[PDB]
Amino acid sequence: QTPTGIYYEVRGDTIYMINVTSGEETPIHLFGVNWFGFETPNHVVHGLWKRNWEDMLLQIKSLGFNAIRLPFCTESVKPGTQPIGIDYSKNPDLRGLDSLQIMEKIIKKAGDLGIFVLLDYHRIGCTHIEPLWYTEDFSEEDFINTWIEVAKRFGKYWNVIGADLKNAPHSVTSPPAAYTDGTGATWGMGNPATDWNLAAERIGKAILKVAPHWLIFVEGTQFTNPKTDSSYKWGYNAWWGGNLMAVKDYPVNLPRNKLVYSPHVYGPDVYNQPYFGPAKGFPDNLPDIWYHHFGYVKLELGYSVVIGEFGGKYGHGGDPRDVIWQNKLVDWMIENKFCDFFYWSWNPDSGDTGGILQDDWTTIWEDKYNNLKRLMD
Numbered sequence: 293q294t295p296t297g298i299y300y301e302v303r304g305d306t307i308y309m310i311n312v313t314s315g316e317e318t319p320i321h322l323f324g325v326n327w328f329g330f331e332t333p334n335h336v337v338h339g340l341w342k343r344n345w346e347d348m349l350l351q352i353k354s355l356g357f358n359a360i361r362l363p364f365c366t367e368s369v370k371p372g373t374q375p376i377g378i379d380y381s382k383n384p385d386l387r388g389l390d391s392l393q394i395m396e397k398i399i400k401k402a403g404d405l406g407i408f409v410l411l412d413y414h415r416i417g418c419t420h421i422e423p424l425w426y427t428e429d430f431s432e433e434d435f436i437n438t439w440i441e442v443a444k445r446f447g448k449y450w451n452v453i454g455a456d457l458k459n460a461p462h463s464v465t466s467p468p469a470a471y472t473d474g475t476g477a478t479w480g481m482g483n484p485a486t487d488w489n490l491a492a493e494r495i496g497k498a499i500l501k502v503a504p505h506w507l508i509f510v511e512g513t514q515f516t517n518p519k520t521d522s523s524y525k526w527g528y529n530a531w532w533g534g535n536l537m538a539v540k541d542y543p544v545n546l547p548r549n550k551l552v553y554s555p556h557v558y559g560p561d562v563y564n565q566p567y568f569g570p571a572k573g574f575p576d577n578l579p580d581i582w583y584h585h586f587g588y589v590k591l592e593l594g595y596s597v598v599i600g601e602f603g604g605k606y607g608h609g610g611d612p613r614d615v616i617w618q619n620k621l622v623d624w625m626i627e628n629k630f631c632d633f634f635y636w637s638w639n640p641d642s643g644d645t646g647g648i649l650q651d652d653w654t655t656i657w658e659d660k661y662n663n664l665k666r667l668m669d
């Protein structure tokens with residue numbers, strides 16, 4: 293049942309932490325941030341050139357977050373990979389430690405602060421997000437074996453809630469072709485080699501044999517099947533990791549009490565979506581978009597839905613409509629009780645979204661955070 297004494301599960305659409313010994317069951321909310329970098333060529337969370345890593349965790353906790361999503365790539369989780377770009381005068385206790393050991397230090401420290409950690413297999417290599425959970429050089433069995441090894445090691449950390457199986461499944465070509473061409477993820481198409489709903493079952497079973505106490509977070513795709521995507525006017529305009537419209541007819545075949553649907557959703561700073569034009573109904577059009585793409589999965593079907601990524605520059609050097617977009621989304625999440633989330637990102641160095649921290653890696657965008665804060669209250 294569990295190597296830690298803690299078992300995570302979903303009841304209703306709420307995530308529970310169970311102390312299996314005492315029998316105590318606590319419902320948890322995930323007020324989370326993404327702290328990225330283990331999936332990049334640095335092979336470490338970013339900003340350790342400007343900050344101490346512990347100081348960073350303390351500051352995250354001081355802002356009322358109690359959860360971190362930790363993106364990783366294959367390399368960062370194999371021993372002996374060496375981190376690049378760390379100021380060791382600021383980080384003495386990180387000297388002579390590899391990308392895996394830092395990852396472990398960060399999680400144990402987070403746990404010390406009651407912070408939950410979601411492990412995210414973000415990239416297969418360490419440069420970009422592939423549309424599928426395999427490449428020419430890295431097979432699905434290789435991907436599954438990496439997850440098995442991640443799960444054997446990090447399953448011993450009480451505060452690790454589970455596995456975001458693959459960051460942002462998506463297409464690298466357009467429909468109708470994208471559905472049959474074998475280069476991008478699908479859902480409900482039929483082909484188990486591209487259909488993310490079927491691959492998430494395989495990879496998830498594999499993880500649950502070794503970390504039975506974990507949760508399996510399954511993102512949306514970008515396109516699913518033409519019948520599903522055609523069912524809604526904005527069916528062809530979902531985010532990578534964002535399209536959960538096929539959950540109703542093609543549910544992932546996994547234990548309901550272990551599964552979390554985890555959509556990405558973004559504003560005009562990531563992509564100039566047609567429904568972001570006031571002409572196409574922005575911003576009042578947004579509740580119904582979100583509903584159709586992923587909101588109905590919780591609100592109609594009652595599964596647990598955790599928004600794994602959302603964010604934007606909040607009018608700081610980007611599209612000013614992002615302020616309206618972030619306000620409207622928080623309003624909607626509060627009204628509809630989506631209280632579990634990971635903001636993208638803690639890091640200021642996300643080129644299209646910036647982060648909670650400003651470019652100085654020290655100070656927060658007060659207004660962006662203030663708006664986010666309403667969800668924590």
Ligand SMILES: OC[C@H]1O[C@@H](O[C@H]2[C@H](O)[C@@H](O)[C@H](O[C@H]3[C@H](O)[C@@H](O)[C@H](O[C@H]4[C@H](O)[C@@H](O)[C@H](O)O[C@@H]4CO)O[C@@H]3CO)O[C@@H]2CO)[C@H](O)[C@@H](O)[C@@H]1O
Nearest residue numbers: 328459460529530531532533556562563641642643644645
């Ligand atoms: O990892 C560090 C890296 O992160 C970047 O932040 C990305 C996230 O890593 C990622 O999970 C997510 O990816 C975006 C992606 O960057 C966009 O190109 C893509 O745009 C899609 C859109 O989704 C579709 O609807 C549209 O049809 O096609 C476009 C592509 O043309 O959207 C996905 C998410 O849906 O979100 C983060 C923000 O982009 C930082 O930007 C980078 O600087 C960091 O190095």
